[PDB]
Amino acid sequence: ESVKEFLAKAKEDFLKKWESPAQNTAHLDQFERIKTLGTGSFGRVMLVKHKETGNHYAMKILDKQKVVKLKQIEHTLNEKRILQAVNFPFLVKLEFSFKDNSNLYMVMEYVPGGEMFSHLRRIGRFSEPHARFYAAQIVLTFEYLHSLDLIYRDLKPENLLIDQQGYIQVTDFGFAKRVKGRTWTLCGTPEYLAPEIILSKGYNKAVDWWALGVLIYEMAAGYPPFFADQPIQIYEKIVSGKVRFPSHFSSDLKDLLRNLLQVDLTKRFGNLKNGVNDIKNHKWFATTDWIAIYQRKVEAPFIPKFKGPGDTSNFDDYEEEEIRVSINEKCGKEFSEF
């Protein structure tokens, strides 16, 4: 009942911003560009410092012409409209957004701990208590997002940041979409795609719960449940209905994952009459205090190392590229509402 009350208020706040999005709330020249933190098909994220406050941020720079060539116009509009409207302890905040002749800009909170991806690959795998701590945060984040009729659609260690307190911050809302009922877009990352996506079946929020199963598996195993050298081989494994677990996986863990990695939607945890509660109440989560997690009162598995503000040693190095702004406006109409 307290959960319903909280979510009801959360939706009221979200819908106000959803219907009236913030737009043009800063300018490129207000930020000092320092270093690239990550890259994508049509842009990059750079560590920046806001000159008037001295605050550090992570600024995503999207080349409008590249967005259009990859047919991601509506997805980029989705991303910005959603991210400026949401608010949850484990979601990165969009602080400013604006555009110029050449690029779109999304100025987000900088999360100095780096990607879960980097730590997971380096350490090999997380213990189950460690993986559970992260997993719980995704569970609550998805409960929140789904209550707003949003689907996230790109869960993976590369899209999860670790903050200074050791907590998760979900970023990368590029495929996030607000949809009541059913949607069809083939998108995501091969290892994490639900069978209904690759089979072009038409799908809903249940694909996020499948992806959570993939994520928990990979965190606790050190490798995903479905992997191969070519995506087609990955897809063949995903739809096959077969999954094998490391012998070190607990029996509770295996039970949870068999229910999350359920090819049959009518049997998938997160998608039954009991909704997210079949997950929250699963044996594997019996020690999880969902409220303490939300309030950030639980001791994290580890805190990332930090050496003063603006330090980036928790991020890989990327090739840098000067930002150029054309003297002509590119793709004005397509991105008008940004």
Place this chain on the structure above:
Amino acid sequence: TTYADFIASGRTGRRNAIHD
């Protein structure tokens, strides 16, 4: 081992999204 197979695979680096 499954772990050794993973580490020798071409997909232990960052994975690109697909679409379209």
